[PDB]
Amino acid sequence: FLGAAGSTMGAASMTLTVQARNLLSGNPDWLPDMTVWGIKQLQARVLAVERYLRDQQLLGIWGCSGKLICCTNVPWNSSWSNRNLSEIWDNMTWLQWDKEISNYTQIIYGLLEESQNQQEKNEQDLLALD
Amino acid sequence: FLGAAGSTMGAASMTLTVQARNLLSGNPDWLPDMTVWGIKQLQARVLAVERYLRDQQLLGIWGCSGKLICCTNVPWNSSWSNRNLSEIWDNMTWLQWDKEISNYTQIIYGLLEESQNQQEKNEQDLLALD
Amino acid sequence: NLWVTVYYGVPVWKDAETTLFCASDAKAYETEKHNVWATHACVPTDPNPQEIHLENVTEEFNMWKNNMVEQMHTDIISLWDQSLKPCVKLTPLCVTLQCTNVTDMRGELKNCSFNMTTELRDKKQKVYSLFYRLDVVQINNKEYRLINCNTSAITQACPKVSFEPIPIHYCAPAGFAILKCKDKKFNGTGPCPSVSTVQCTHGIKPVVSTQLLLNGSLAEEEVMIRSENITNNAKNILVQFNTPVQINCTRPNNNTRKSIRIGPGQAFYATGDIIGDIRQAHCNVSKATWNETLGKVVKQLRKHFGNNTIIRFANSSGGDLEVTTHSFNCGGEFFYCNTSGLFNSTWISNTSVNDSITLPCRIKQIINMWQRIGQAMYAPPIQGVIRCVSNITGLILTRDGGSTNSTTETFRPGGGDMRDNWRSELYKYKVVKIEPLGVAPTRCKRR
Amino acid sequence: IRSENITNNAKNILVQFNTPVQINCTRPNNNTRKSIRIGPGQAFYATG
Amino acid sequence: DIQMTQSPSTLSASIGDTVRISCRASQSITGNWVAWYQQRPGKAPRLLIYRGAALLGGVPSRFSGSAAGTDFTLTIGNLQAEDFGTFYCQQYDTYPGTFGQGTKVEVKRTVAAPSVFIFPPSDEQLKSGTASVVCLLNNFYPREAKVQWKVDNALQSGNSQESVTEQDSKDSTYSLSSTLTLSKADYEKHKVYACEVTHQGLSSPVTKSFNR
Amino acid sequence: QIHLVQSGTEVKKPGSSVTVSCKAYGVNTFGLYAVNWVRQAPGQSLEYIGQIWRWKSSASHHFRGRVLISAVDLTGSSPPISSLEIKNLTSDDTAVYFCTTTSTYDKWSGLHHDGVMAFSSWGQGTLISVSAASTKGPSVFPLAPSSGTAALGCLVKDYFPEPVTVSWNSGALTSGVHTFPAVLQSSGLYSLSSVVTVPSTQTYICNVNHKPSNTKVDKKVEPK
Ligand SMILES: *[C@@H]1O[C@H](CO)[C@@H](O[C@@H]2O[C@H](CO)[C@@H](O[C@@H]3O[C@H](CO[C@H]4O[C@H](CO[C@H]5O[C@H](CO)[C@@H](O)[C@H](O)[C@@H]5O[C@H]5O[C@H](CO)[C@@H](O)[C@H](O)[C@@H]5O)[C@@H](O)[C@H](O[C@H]5O[C@H](CO)[C@@H](O)[C@H](O)[C@@H]5O[C@H]5O[C@H](CO)[C@@H](O)[C@H](O)[C@@H]5O)[C@@H]4O)[C@@H](O)[C@H](O[C@H]4O[C@H](CO)[C@@H](O)[C@H](O)[C@@H]4O[C@H]4O[C@H](CO)[C@@H](O)[C@H](O)[C@@H]4O[C@H]4O[C@H](CO)[C@@H](O)[C@H](O)[C@@H]4O)[C@@H]3O)[C@H](O)[C@H]2NC(C)=O)[C@H](O)[C@H]1NC(C)=O
Ligand SMILES: *[C@@H]1O[C@H](CO)[C@@H](O[C@@H]2O[C@H](CO)[C@@H](O[C@@H]3O[C@H](CO[C@H]4O[C@H](CO[C@H]5O[C@H](CO)[C@@H](O)[C@H](O)[C@@H]5O)[C@@H](O)[C@H](O[C@H]5O[C@H](CO)[C@@H](O)[C@H](O)[C@@H]5O)[C@@H]4O)[C@@H](O)[C@H](O[C@H]4O[C@H](CO)[C@@H](O)[C@H](O)[C@@H]4O[C@H]4O[C@H](CO)[C@@H](O)[C@H](O)[C@@H]4O)[C@@H]3O)[C@H](O)[C@H]2NC(C)=O)[C@H](O)[C@H]1NC(C)=O
Ligand SMILES: *[C@@H]1O[C@H](CO)[C@@H](O[C@@H]2O[C@H](CO)[C@@H](O[C@@H]3O[C@H](CO[C@H]4O[C@H](CO[C@H]5O[C@H](CO)[C@@H](O)[C@H](O)[C@@H]5O)[C@@H](O)[C@H](O[C@H]5O[C@H](CO)[C@@H](O)[C@H](O)[C@@H]5O)[C@@H]4O)[C@@H](O)[C@H](O[C@H]4O[C@H](CO)[C@@H](O)[C@H](O)[C@@H]4O[C@H]4O[C@H](CO)[C@@H](O)[C@H](O)[C@@H]4O)[C@@H]3O)[C@H](O)[C@H]2NC(C)=O)[C@H](O)[C@H]1NC(C)=O
Ligand SMILES: *[C@@H]1O[C@H](CO)[C@@H](O[C@@H]2O[C@H](CO)[C@@H](O[C@@H]3O[C@H](CO)[C@@H](O)[C@H](O[C@H]4O[C@H](CO)[C@@H](O)[C@H](O)[C@@H]4O[C@H]4O[C@H](CO)[C@@H](O)[C@H](O)[C@@H]4O)[C@@H]3O)[C@H](O)[C@H]2NC(C)=O)[C@H](O)[C@H]1NC(C)=O
Ligand SMILES: *[C@@H]1O[C@H](CO)[C@@H](O[C@@H]2O[C@H](CO)[C@@H](O[C@@H]3O[C@H](CO[C@H]4O[C@H](CO)[C@@H](O)[C@H](O)[C@@H]4O)[C@@H](O)[C@H](O[C@H]4O[C@H](CO)[C@@H](O)[C@H](O)[C@@H]4O)[C@@H]3O)[C@H](O)[C@H]2NC(C)=O)[C@H](O)[C@H]1NC(C)=O
Ligand SMILES: *[C@@H]1O[C@H](CO)[C@@H](O[C@@H]2O[C@H](CO)[C@@H](O[C@@H]3O[C@H](CO[C@H]4O[C@H](CO)[C@@H](O)[C@H](O)[C@@H]4O)[C@@H](O)[C@H](O)[C@@H]3O)[C@H](O)[C@H]2NC(C)=O)[C@H](O)[C@H]1NC(C)=O
Ligand SMILES: *[C@@H]1O[C@H](CO)[C@@H](O[C@@H]2O[C@H](CO)[C@@H](O[C@@H]3O[C@H](CO)[C@@H](O)[C@H](O)[C@@H]3O)[C@H](O)[C@H]2NC(C)=O)[C@H](O)[C@H]1NC(C)=O
Ligand SMILES: *[C@@H]1O[C@H](CO)[C@@H](O[C@@H]2O[C@H](CO)[C@@H](O[C@@H]3O[C@H](CO)[C@@H](O)[C@H](O)[C@@H]3O)[C@H](O)[C@H]2NC(C)=O)[C@H](O)[C@H]1NC(C)=O
Ligand SMILES: *[C@@H]1O[C@H](CO)[C@@H](O[C@@H]2O[C@H](CO)[C@@H](O)[C@H](O)[C@H]2NC(C)=O)[C@H](O)[C@H]1NC(C)=O
Ligand SMILES: *[C@@H]1O[C@H](CO)[C@@H](O[C@@H]2O[C@H](CO)[C@@H](O)[C@H](O)[C@H]2NC(C)=O)[C@H](O)[C@H]1NC(C)=O
Ligand SMILES: *[C@@H]1O[C@H](CO)[C@@H](O)[C@H](O)[C@H]1NC(C)=O
């Protein structure tokens, strides 16, 4: 549970499953509720499922369609964190990583939904016909 | 956003992603609520997620298992809108299209869940054994 | 060469605010007594709360900016109103009170005769009751009235429910997390070397008190000193004790409940005659234990105010009763204690120049805490003598503005804001939201 | 000009203006509030 | 160790103008870790933009940053009086942080020629054993100017010091002094002393001399 | 709000040890705020020296170990204070030193980058001049106009230490006056000038006040 957050990105890939589990599902679960303080234990968990499906759309509309890790045809731009491969996984941490990509984060997002699954699935339709 | 609804089906395939996005997720999002008019801003968004998962079951139980476009092994029956290929995409519109298929709509649905993923996955089990 | 790849569940979070729920340990529910304090539908606590220590991590904390406090403060307030809603409203108690002096200590109790409406709407009822001087005010024999009638309305708390504080774990919903600072010495500000995460916070007893933190969490090793702005005398100074201080607060009046009938269906509990010791409420503090702590605490202030300086203590300056006295609840009754005897001392650099001590306490049944207007709560009478023993775990302190800063400084008991009481237990906690989505470059591409 | 059923005189006729019409509505009585006390806690505002 | 290069070292711009000051780092900075500071003369430097485009709260919208690879540029539209001063670019990308050459933003106005005056050494100064000839440049635009010392039609090396006033608050002009420090013995050995100045304003050669 | 007040002007001789202090007003603690010491060479750019962050002192490879940064947190009588020391003082250390800090609480702020950061708050600054010289009184000389229009002024040479205040007719003449900044002569003494532009009688005068040497000497100006 977040144990590798201080560790390097290379080491942070092993416990990846643990974060997926605990984060995904959270039910206490208690049926009882009352007019006040029942709406308080509701408003919190309702926002949980709204924030969740928000994330899931990206997983589907992108080249993943599945959880954990999945890859894509988007080439990594040099202008986006020009680096050494061992300088990323072995020498650097995720929090330290997301810090720099903050400018290019929205750009990459476009490459996943538009450049791929919009143009890839259409490409697939043209390649599955023959 | 719906811009190609008046345009032809062939042109309506380019902006397909836009409709998927905006339709999928709708959070204002405001936590505050009250006993009356709080139940009004609830009843609407609760029906939103109920109508949503209703659609998602069909995507999974059919030969898609993924969003946007996906194909299937169901052959197109001549009795179902016997037409020209250029008479569909190039000369005709979706609203005009769904208008005629209204009779055969329920029939096709059966071919996707039964004739395919019931008989296809079982076929896959028999083909994945060897 | 590489290609972008989506990683799901990467350890990345951002500081944020959400709506937190409670946890009752699923035992408080068996304590029953018709919804004690909070626990009614309250989430039972996971029998095995999880605490995961994060290595190679340093996070900066601020307890004064903590949002869990504001939620908890508003929680107790919202909790208070929901308890008083189903109960019996005392609205037609504003009837004239003909009072006289009780049979010593300048007649603190008033025996009052008054007219009251019965179950029937025809004939009134001539009955007498017993109110404290603080609950009544004369208007011009001796004629009095309810002290809250000119300010607001009033309602009686139900005898079934109890105000007994029970441990409450604040937990976060899915998508959120709660951080815990495991360091022994933490003032609530600065970087935290060792940080662990929990789904639920530790056991927190919502004990509402003034000038004394009761039934709280002990510090580690040295006693802790916390202040929002220290050199600023306008900001209160929170202290965390190492060893708990034995305190006794009793109600040396053995009472009875009238349970008068103002029907149909409603019954009010009046305070009957006192049978037993004729005494005023009192608070005991052992002279040896308080002093020992004082000697240890006064040295911590000199880690700031300088190695050598004169620190004098004194009682409350003045203000509302809630500010000037120690306000709390024991056995259902609300005590207001005179702390002037403890705060009378003068200390040298390391030292200050009998077997027991006592503190005069005042009792008030009708209260408006948190500066509430429009709603006044009446504390119902309790059968027999009430005795309670609690831990004194910390204080609320203020520094004088008169300076002469380079000469000496004097400290007096604080009060007011109850958020500080919650900041005492929540200093090591803060709320952050988890951002699972992440992207990384790799060669795998796709077919 | 809008009407549900026009030839029908039983149906109201809704009109939409082009230019807005200036209208003034005032209370040419300068008043005071009594704020009488019908307690406990309640206060009614009478017209003085 | 990063080296930051600013261009130009100084520039002349008017009110309402759009000013662009670029900067280049010895390497490529990604994550866009770059800062731009403003410093008015005689005052401590103030932070304007961090992360190259991220403007700090309270700064006017007229300031705009841009960050791409090795090349960085700060854009200031609708130039105003309070904006004039010296600007620096800084990288906190790696340990330690390094600043740029600095860029002096200087007020633009019609080119103004100085009025040159030369003052012969005072009598009481001659008795001290030294003689200092002072060439004066009054209000002039721009700050960049030349002052050379010719003794009997011969240049002088060393023993020369010049002084420059800050750009005037209203006139937006500069004033320049020149100090020639020589002894008494060498002073009696020569006759005519000349101060040669050349500036964008004059449109004529200027030399002010005295026959003592 | 945030106010950084540094120590007074320090003039020290080579080989000695210097101590400057930075009082940080408005700062709750140095735990949530990183403190960076930055110096500025005269007529030159800014240079990062070192920092103390999370109560850990650190400095650049130029100054390793030779520069010592110490700080104490918020106390009951004064705001948080930091101090910077440079031993084995030399002539190249004459830069103007600034005490800076930055808010580190925001973990995703662009202000900081793992120890290396920008500087949000700037102090008043403290000038350190390293030179072997003793205080002396100013020599004042008049500059007489020969004859377009006319110009006259007074010349102040060889004073120490700075500054000196030069006036005209005891502050009566405030217009058209340009007082040139003091220039550091090769002799280690300062010299400056104050000149006034005159058209075409009034018989002006110079008011010079040197406080360190306590010399308020005033000189007149007569045309030859
Ligand atoms: C809340 O809570 C929290 C927690 O809990 C808290 O926090 C806290 O805080 C505090 C404050 O207040 C703190 O403390 C502090 O600290 C600091 C720092 O320290 C550190 O550092 C240092 C320095 O460093 C450097 O050096 C070194 C050498 O050695 C090295 O090694 C390093 O590395 C560094 O370096 C770097 O840099 C360079 C350049 O620069 C480069 O080159 C390199 O490379 C690098 O990078 C040091 O020194 C230290 O050390 C020490 O200590 C330790 C312990 O601590 C140890 O371990 C060691 O060993 C040592 O020891 C020693 O010493 C000590 C001292 O004390 C002793 O004790 C011992 O025994 C021995 O001897 C460290 O590391 C500091 O600085 C400070 O100090 C200050 O204060 C004190 C009192 O307290 C005093 O005494 C001192 O002196 C000081 O003071 C100063 O300053 C001030 C201000 O500024 C002034 O005023 C004064 O006067 C002074 O000054 C003086 O001195 C100087 C010198 O120093 C000179 O210069 C001058 O002139 C004068 O003379 C303090 O201590 C803590 O820490 C914290 N904690 C934690 C846990 O973190 C807070 O506070 C709270 N809050 C509230 C409100 O309450
Ligand atoms: C938490 O609590 C703490 C305390 O509990 C709070 O700390 C308080 O912080 C405020 C800042 O908001 C401080 O006020 C500020 O003080 C500075 C510094 O003043 C001191 O030093 C001055 C100079 O000292 C040097 O020079 C002399 C002479 O050579 C030397 O001898 C010295 O040794 C030093 O080297 C000095 O002039 C000051 O004295 C004057 O003021 C005091 C205090 O009022 C009087 O007693 C004195 O008699 C005398 O009058 C003092 O000793 C000031 O510079 C600040 O002034 C700015 O702000 C004013 C508004 O308050 C404003 O009117 C001024 O014009 C001035 O603004 C100027 O500077 C800005 C920044 O550069 C510019 O933007 C602006 O345009 C303008 O140019 C200010 O007064 C408090 O002193 C400090 N408390 C204590 C007890 O010291 C903290 O704020 C709290 N924080 C939070 C988050 O809760
Ligand atoms: C919105 O509002 C509008 C108005 O605001 C509403 O409009 C109203 O709609 C109703 C329909 O429900 C109309 O009533 C119907 O009128 C017709 C036509 O009647 C006229 O023409 C007749 C013939 O005219 C021709 O022939 C002569 C002779 O050659 C020529 O000279 C002419 O020029 C023509 O060429 C004529 O006979 C009528 O006159 C009679 O009626 C009027 C009105 O009452 C009297 O004043 C006269 O004196 C005279 O008695 C008239 O001029 C009728 O044919 C309809 O009758 C049917 O419905 C009756 C119930 O109301 C029922 O009792 C009849 O038996 C008849 O039903 C017959 O027809 C059905 C359809 O074929 C069969 O299914 C059925 O089995 C049976 O065979 C009816 O009276 C209103 O007139 C009209 N309002 C106005 C002002 O004109 C509208 O309804 C509203 N809608 C909504 C959604 O809100
Ligand atoms: C607030 O109230 C609490 C609770 O009342 C106080 O805490 C209690 O403090 C008392 C006294 O300080 C303490 O009582 C003693 O506890 C001992 C055990 O810890 C007992 O052994 C002891 O009993 C002996 O003494 C009594 C009185 O002298 C006798 O009546 C009793 O029979 C005992 O005598 C026996 O033992 C001797 C040998 O020692 C033998 O020769 C005899 O034959 C006989 O067998 C005391 O009762 C309580 O333990 C404390 N309670 C707690 C929970 O700590 C607190 O002090 C109050 N605070 C203030 C400020 O007033
Ligand atoms: C700070 O923390 C201390 C300690 O936790 C609190 O002290 C508690 O005070 C409450 C009363 O407010 C105590 O509750 C009392 O429990 C007694 C023991 O109950 C056990 O024993 C009986 C047999 O006698 C069993 O049947 C029962 O199941 C339990 O196992 C009861 O005897 C008490 O009832 C009597 O007192 C109350 C008033 O005190 C009357 O209303 C009753 O009618 C009756 O006369 C009562 O239920 C609790 O036990 C105390 N804690 C401990 C550890 O003993 C402080 O209150 C707290 N400070 C604040 C401000 O809340
Ligand atoms: C790289 O990504 C960075 C992500 O943080 C970018 O930083 C952001 O850049 C934008 C660009 O303009 C800034 O937008 C301006 O913000 C200021 C101040 O906003 C902040 O401060 C206020 C004041 O307290 C606070 O209320 C806000 O909530 C903000 O946190 C506004 O005043 C301007 O009008 C304008 O909107 C962001 O502020 C800035 N920081 C953030 C988002 O934290 C950076 O620009 C990117 N780099 C490039 C080259 O684009
Ligand atoms: C206030 O705190 C001080 C400590 O700072 C307390 O002083 C304590 O006094 C007792 C005596 O009443 C000391 O006990 C003595 O022990 C010695 C050594 O065993 C023995 O020779 C004596 O006969 C006596 O028994 C005790 O040691 C001392 N505390 C310390 C730390 O030395 C004081 O009691 C406190 N205030 C009160 C209410 O007394
Ligand atoms: C602050 O606390 C001190 C210490 O308790 C208080 O001093 C106390 O003053 C009373 C007088 O009101 C003393 O009573 C006296 O006792 C002696 C000895 O039996 C007797 O000779 C006298 O006639 C009188 O009865 C008491 O002893 C004394 N405390 C000690 C430990 O000696 C002081 O009054 C307190 N100040 C305030 C403002 O409350
Ligand atoms: C408080 O006053 C009431 C009277 O208003 C006392 O009740 C009376 O007690 C005497 C005993 O001396 C009886 O003879 C009367 O019949 C009682 N009258 C009523 C109306 O109850 C009461 O005793 C006083 N307080 C107490 C109980 O000490
Ligand atoms: C709280 O304790 C103080 C200290 O004993 C009390 O102060 C006394 O006040 C009375 C007047 O009401 C004086 O006659 C006494 O001389 C004071 N005592 C001392 C030791 O000075 C105070 O009255 C107590 N309670 C309240 C409500 O103030
Ligand atoms: C009753 O005691 C009060 C003290 O609170 C006193 O003011 C009053 O005079 C006393 N009444 C009588 C009748 O003695």
Give φ, ψ of C336 to 5 degrees. -125, 110
Please indicate whether residue F106, judged by its CB atom, sits closer than 6 Å to ligand 1. no
- C55 touching A (Cβ < 8 Å): yes
User: Could you tell me if E120 and E210 are in contact, meaning their C-beta atoms sit under 8 angstroms apart?
Assistant: yes
Shortest CA distance from A117: residue in chain B: B68
Q: How many other C-beta atoms can be found within 10 angstroms of the C-beta atom of residue F217?
A: 15
| F29 vs E92: CA distance, rounded Å | 23
* Resolution of the solved structure (Å): 6.9
| C25 vs C39: CA distance, rounded Å | 10
| B58 vs B30: CA distance, rounded Å | 31
Give the count of domains, chain A: 1
- Greatest C-alpha distance within chain C: 100
Please indicate whether residue F88, judged by its CB atom, sits closer than 6 Å to ligand 1. no
Shortest CA distance from A116: residue in chain B: B17
Tell me how far the alpha carbon of residue C288 lies from the centroid of ligand 8, in angstroms: 17
**Closest C-alpha among C215, C398, C382 to residue C313:** C398
* Residue list, ligand 3 pocket, CB within 6 Å: D 5, 7-8
Amino acid, single-letter form, for residue A90: D
Q: Is CATH 3.30.465.10 the right assignment for the domain spanning E109-212?
A: no
Q: Sheet of E116-119: strands edge to edge? A: E116-119, E130-140, E174-183, E160-164
- C304 touching F (Cβ < 8 Å): yes
**Closest C-alpha among E13, C235, E31, C345 to residue F109:** E31
E strands present in C65-163: 97-101, 109-117, 124-132, 136-138, 142-146, 155-156
Please indicate whether residue C446, judged by its CB atom, sits closer than 6 Å to ligand 11. no
- E165 touching F (Cβ < 8 Å): yes
Best of D8, D11, D12 for a ligand 3 pocket test (most atoms within 8 Å of beta carbon): D8
Please indicate whether residue F72, judged by its CB atom, sits closer than 6 Å to ligand 1. yes
> Angle B105-112/B40-61 helices, nearest 10 degrees?
60
**Closest C-alpha among E134, E147, E120 to residue E202:** E147
> Angle C67-84/C419-426 helices, nearest 10 degrees?
130
Tell how far CA F124 is from the center of its chain: 9
3-class DSSP assignment, residue A73:
strand
Q: How far is F108 from chain A (nearest CA, A)?
A: 7
**Could you tell me the CA-to-CA distances from E209 to E81, E118, E134, E176 in Å, in that order?**
38, 7, 11, 17
Strand pairing class (C408-413; C310-313): parallel
- F33 touching C (Cβ < 8 Å): no
- C306 touching F (Cβ < 8 Å): yes
Tell me how far the alpha carbon of residue C294 lies from the centroid of ligand 5, in angstroms: 30
For F59, the token pair is 């400095």
- Using the beta-carbon criterion (under 8 Å), do A79 and E31 form an inter-chain contact? no
Do E109-212 and E1-108 have the same topology in CATH?
Answer: yes
Exposed, middle or buried by CB within 10 Å (0-12, 13-18, 19+), for F115?
middle
Exposed, middle or buried by CB within 10 Å (0-12, 13-18, 19+), for B95?
exposed
CA atoms within 13 A on the CB side of F209: 6
Three-state SS annotation for C357-390: CEEEEEECCEECCCCCCCCCEECCCCCEEEEEEE
* Chains E+F touching (3+ CB pairs under 8 Å): yes
| C138 vs C98: CA distance, rounded Å | 9
For C268, the token pair is 């009010």
Please indicate whether residue E59, judged by its CB atom, sits closer than 6 Å to ligand 6. no
Give φ, ψ of C401 to 5 degrees. -90, -20
| Nearest ligand, CA C321 | 10
Tell me how far the alpha carbon of residue C287 lies from the centroid of ligand 7, in angstroms: 12
Q: How many other C-beta atoms can be found within 10 angstroms of the C-beta atom of residue E75?
A: 15
* Residue list, ligand 2 pocket, CB within 6 Å: C 229, 231-232; F 1, 3, 5, 7-8, 25-26, 28, 79
CA atoms within 13 A on the CB side of E5: 7
Q: How far is B34 from chain A (nearest CA, A)?
A: 9
Tell me which residue has tokens 């119902």: C380
User: Could you tell me if E142 and E10 are in contact, meaning their C-beta atoms sit under 8 angstroms apart?
Assistant: no
Residue partners of C418: CB distance under 8 A and separation at least 6: C73, C76, C208, C370
| A67 vs A17: CA distance, rounded Å | 10
Residues of F in contact with C409 (CB under 8 A): 76
User: Could you tell me if C167 and C204 are in contact, meaning their C-beta atoms sit under 8 angstroms apart?
Assistant: yes
Q: How far is C156 from chain D (nearest CA, A)?
A: 14
Q: What dihedral do alpha carbons A58, A62, A66, A70 form, nearest 10°?
A: -120
| C393 vs C226: CA distance, rounded Å | 14
| C59 vs B12: CA distance, rounded Å | 51
Tell me how far the alpha carbon of residue A30 lies from the centroid of ligand 4, in angstroms: 46
For F49, the token pair is 């020296």
- Using the beta-carbon criterion (under 8 Å), do E100 and F45 form an inter-chain contact? yes
Q: Write down the number of H helices and E strands in chain B.
A: 6, 0
Cis peptide before F142 (omega within 30 of 0): no
Tell me which residue has tokens 């002290």: C147
**Closest C-alpha among C285, D5, D41, C37 to residue A37:** C37
3-class DSSP assignment, residue A56:
helix
| Nearest ligand, CA C340 | 10
Tell how far CA F133 is from the center of its chain: 18
Q: How far is D40 from chain C (nearest CA, A)?
A: 5
Q: Helical H runs in C301-365?
A: 321-324
**Could you tell me the CA-to-CA distances from E104 to C60, C217, E39, E143, F44 in Å, in that order?**
39, 59, 9, 11, 12
Give φ, ψ of C119 to 5 degrees. -60, -40
Residues of E in contact with F149 (CB under 8 A): 115
Tell me how far the alpha carbon of residue C108 lies from the centroid of ligand 9, in angstroms: 18
**Could you tell me the CA-to-CA distances from C238 to C247, C412, C423, E194, F195 in Å, in that order?**
19, 12, 9, 77, 63
For F72, the token pair is 């104490």
**A82, A83, A103: residue with CB nearest E32:** A103
User: Could you tell me if C343 and C215 are in contact, meaning their C-beta atoms sit under 8 angstroms apart?
Assistant: no
DSSP H or E stretch at residue B42: helix B40-61
Residues of F in contact with E90 (CB under 8 A): 46, 118
E strands present in chain F: 3-6, 10-12, 18-25, 33-40, 46-53, 56-59, 67-72, 81-86, 96-103, 112-113, 116-117, 121-122, 126-130, 139-143, 150-159, 165-168, 178-184, 190-198, 205-209, 218-220
Q: Which residue's alpha carbon is at the smallest distance from atom 7 of ligand 6?
A: E54
Residue partners of F147: CB distance under 8 A and separation at least 6: none
User: Could you tell me if A61 and A113 are in contact, meaning their C-beta atoms sit under 8 angstroms apart?
Assistant: yes
User: Could you tell me if C115 and C345 are in contact, meaning their C-beta atoms sit under 8 angstroms apart?
Assistant: no
**Closest C-alpha among A106, A113, A122, A105 to residue A63:** A113
User: Could you tell me if F17 and F85 are in contact, meaning their C-beta atoms sit under 8 angstroms apart?
Assistant: yes
**Closest C-alpha among C162, C74, C73 to residue C425:** C73
Amino acid, single-letter form, for residue F68: L
Tell me how far the alpha carbon of residue A76 lies from the centroid of ligand 6, in angstroms: 26
Residues of E in contact with A82 (CB under 8 A): 28, 30
Exposed, middle or buried by CB within 10 Å (0-12, 13-18, 19+), for D15?
exposed
**Could you tell me the CA-to-CA distances from A125 to B68, B94, C242 in Å, in that order?**
12, 19, 72
The dihedral through the CA atoms of E103, E108, E112, E116 has a sign that is: negative
User: Could you tell me if C287 and C355 are in contact, meaning their C-beta atoms sit under 8 angstroms apart?
Assistant: yes
**Could you tell me the CA-to-CA distances from F218 to E16, F138, F175, F196 in Å, in that order?**
46, 11, 20, 16
**A7, A20, A25: residue with CB nearest C9:** A20
Tell how far CA F25 is from the center of its chain: 21
Range(s) of the domain holding residue B18: 1-130
- Using the beta-carbon criterion (under 8 Å), do B27 and A65 form an inter-chain contact? no
Tell how far CA E45 is from the center of its chain: 17
| E83 vs B73: CA distance, rounded Å | 70
| C214 vs C247: CA distance, rounded Å | 9
Q: How many other C-beta atoms can be found within 10 angstroms of the C-beta atom of residue F10?
A: 14
The dihedral through the CA atoms of B103, B109, B110, B112 has a sign that is: positive
Structure determination method: X-ray
Residue partners of F65: CB distance under 8 A and separation at least 6: none
Residues of D in contact with C149 (CB under 8 A): 39-40
**Closest C-alpha among F47, F104, F95, F37 to residue E88:** F47
Rg (CA), chain A: 19
**Measured distance between the N- and C-terminal CA atoms of chain C, rounded to whole angstroms:** 16
Please indicate whether residue C284, judged by its CB atom, sits closer than 6 Å to ligand 4. yes
Residues of A in contact with B69 (CB under 8 A): 121-122, 125
| Nearest ligand, CA F107 | 6
Q: How many other C-beta atoms can be found within 10 angstroms of the C-beta atom of residue B129?
A: 6
3-class DSSP assignment, residue B85:
helix
C357 CA: nearest ligand 4 atom: 60
**Could you tell me the CA-to-CA distances from E18 to C121, E8, E82 in Å, in that order?**
86, 15, 14
Tell how far CA D28 is from the center of its chain: 16
| F103 vs F28: CA distance, rounded Å | 11
Give φ, ψ of E81 to 5 degrees. -60, -45
Angle at F17 between CA F12 and CA F20, to 5 degrees: 80
User: Could you tell me if C318 and C346 are in contact, meaning their C-beta atoms sit under 8 angstroms apart?
Assistant: no
| Nearest ligand, CA C359 | 10
Q: Sheet of C429-434: strands edge to edge? A: C13-15, C429-434, C176-181, C195-198, C51-54
- Greatest C-alpha distance within chain B: 62
Q: How many other C-beta atoms can be found within 10 angstroms of the C-beta atom of residue C256?
A: 15
DSSP letter string, F152-218: EEEEEEEEBSS--EEEETTTT--SS-EEEEEEE-TTS-EEEEEEEEE------EEEEEBTTTTB--E
Tell me how far the alpha carbon of residue C256 lies from the centroid of ligand 9, in angstroms: 15
DSSP letter string, C252-284: EEEE-B--EE-SSS-EE--B----S-----EEE
Cis peptide before A35 (omega within 30 of 0): no
For B92, the token pair is 């005709």
| Nearest ligand, CA C384 | 5
Q: Which CATH architecture has domain E1-108?
A: Sandwich (2.60)
- Could you tell me how many CB contacts below 8 A there are between chain C and chain F? 53
**Closest C-alpha among E153, E161, E141, E160 to residue E202:** E141
Q: How many other C-beta atoms can be found within 10 angstroms of the C-beta atom of residue F187?
A: 13
**Closest C-alpha among A70, A124, A61, A129 to residue B66:** A61
What are the structural domain ranges in chain E? 1-108, 109-212
Tell me how far the alpha carbon of residue A27 lies from the centroid of ligand 8, in angstroms: 62
- C444 touching A (Cβ < 8 Å): yes
Q: How far is C28 from chain A (nearest CA, A)?
A: 15
- D41 touching C (Cβ < 8 Å): yes
Three-state SS annotation for chain E: CCCEEEECCEEEECCCCCEEEEEEECCCCCCCCCEEEEECCCCCCEEEEECCCEECCCCCCCEEEEEECCEEEEEECCCCHHHCEEEEEEECCCCCCEECCCEEEEECCCCCCCCEEEECCCHHHHCCCEEEEEEEEEEECCCCCEEEEEECCCECCCCEEEEECCCCCCCCCEEEEEEEEEECHHHHCCCCEEEEEECCCCCCCEEEEECC
| E25 vs E37: CA distance, rounded Å | 16
